[PDB]
Amino acid sequence: MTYKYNCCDDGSGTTVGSVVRFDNVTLLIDPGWNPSKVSYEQCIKYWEKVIPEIDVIILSQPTIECLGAHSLLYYNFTSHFISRIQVYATLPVINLGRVSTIDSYASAGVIGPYDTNKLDLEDIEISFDHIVPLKYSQLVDLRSRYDGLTLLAYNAGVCPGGSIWCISTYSEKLVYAKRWNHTRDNILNAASILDATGKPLSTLMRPSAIITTLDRFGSSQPFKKRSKIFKDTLKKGLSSDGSVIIPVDMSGKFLDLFTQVHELLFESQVPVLILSYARGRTLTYAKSMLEWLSPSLLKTWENRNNTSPFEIGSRIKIIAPNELSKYPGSKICFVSEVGALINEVIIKVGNSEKTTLILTKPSFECASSLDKILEIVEQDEDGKSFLCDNYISIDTIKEEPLSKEETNFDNLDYLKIDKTLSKRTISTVNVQLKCSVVILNLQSLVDQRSASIIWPSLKSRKIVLSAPKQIQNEEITAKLIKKNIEVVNMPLNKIVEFS
DSSP, X not given: OOEEXXXXXXXXXXXXXXXXXXXXXXXXXXXXXXXXXXXXXXXXXXXXXXXXXXXXXXXXXXXXXXXXXXXXXXXXXXXXXXXXOEEEXXXXXXXXXXHHHHHHHHHTTSSSSBTTOOSOHHHHHHHHHTSEEEOTTOOEEETTTTTTEEEEEEEOSSSTTOEEEEEEOXXXXXXXXXXXXXSOOSXXXXXXTBOTTSOBOSTTSSOSEEEEOOSOOOOSSXXXXXXXXXXXXXXXXXXXXOEEEEEEOTTTHHHHHHHHHHXXXXXXXXXXXXXXXXXXXXXXXXXXXXXXXXXXXXXXXXXXXXXXXXXXXXXXXXXXXXXXXXXXXXXXXXXXXXXXXXXXXXXXXXXXXXXXXXXXXXXXXXXXXXXXXXXXXXXOXXXXXXXXXXXXXXXXXXXXXXXXXXXXXXXXXXXXXXXXXXXXXXXXXXXXXXXXXXXXXXXXXXXXXXXXXXXXXXXXXXXXXXXXXXXXXXXXXXXXXXXXOEEEEOOSSOOEEEO
8 A cells, every 4th residue: 555665875876775664664675785885884874874764684695785784784783683673584595694794794804803803703603693594485474563564585596595585464565586597507496486387476476566676687598508608618727737717706606606617527636726715614504505405406416426516525625815826737716706815816826828717797896806807808809718918907915913003614713813913905916917718697697588578477567676777777677668567767765655
């Protein structure tokens, strides 16, 4: 009969949250944060006037763009959580969310033994420990306390635990989907929207409105095809003294791709390096969440010995950048796409011609260097290795002893404070790229065509898009507006009454 919607903006000009106001409930969906864009202080000042109004929080992806602000919110507004706010999320979103948060807060210096420390590692753990864990289809009955509020999570297929939310009240009903993959990938099943007959899920059928976005899409090619293309780029990358560097989101593409390079290695030594502030935790967590991955993947690896999809003999090595030297020749390197790490790696291996940079997506929000590297390639005229011959400005960190006045695979004590603090002194450096660069679209997201076809399969009158209009695909909007669907292009930070 009437409810309010609001796309939160902390100053980065993008949506860092969706607020839904129903008669007696105010829910916050996906409070994101991008440290490289908004500072810790600006982040706080933004949410300060928002938190006291929030009742329920829900997370739909383990990515910082969906849950990046949670630990900072929990730490800075603890009283509001201990008193009423309840955070709900899928198990994997909780667990990988704690790895994406660590890497992100670490890179930006929010946590760690630095003069800029704002909170501690144990603070991130405590924040996620307090999230109410869910399984897909597990009903969150809040009908008595919040006038018929029911929240249901379904498989969205982007990250393990990724989800699509079915929000309801005795009258209104919203289908939320920030990110979803219509097709399957190496480790996840397709989104639970449509089944093995293309018939839309029972519930979710007649939504008072669909809340989503249309600014990012996967390739129009089937997964199996994209998989082969990725596998080829690896063979050529490892060719000769071939060395490969793959920037990755530890809660996103990493687990997918790891599984794929594993399906190439143990099907024919070249080590697999993992540089992440969370170190080995992403692999551990993954090993304990098998019931969330597709059965196909699991059986594919069962047929072998008691081999997990996340283990490769004595291959895997968990190391830091100042240890890249130890591995001379061929080597596949997964680097957490966080600026503090990415930048140190490009500086150490970008000058070599025996290096092949594999970029899996259109842009990188936490690493300005990869975006700069994207422009150079796109500035020059399927899987071709563009050879670099260009200089680029890159910021580098040198940890200096804190004199400016102080007054095993999962172990992260190095991020805790003991007695050795230091300041991160930044300096801009120049690097001449001679490495090779490959650009693919391996994003486990729904392609443009499918989106315009599936979304209407729900007898929904409205589809609401977030963030600013400028990123919302004008193209697909037409098709939808054509198919008698009202499309509301949301503004930033402005409540909007719907019916």
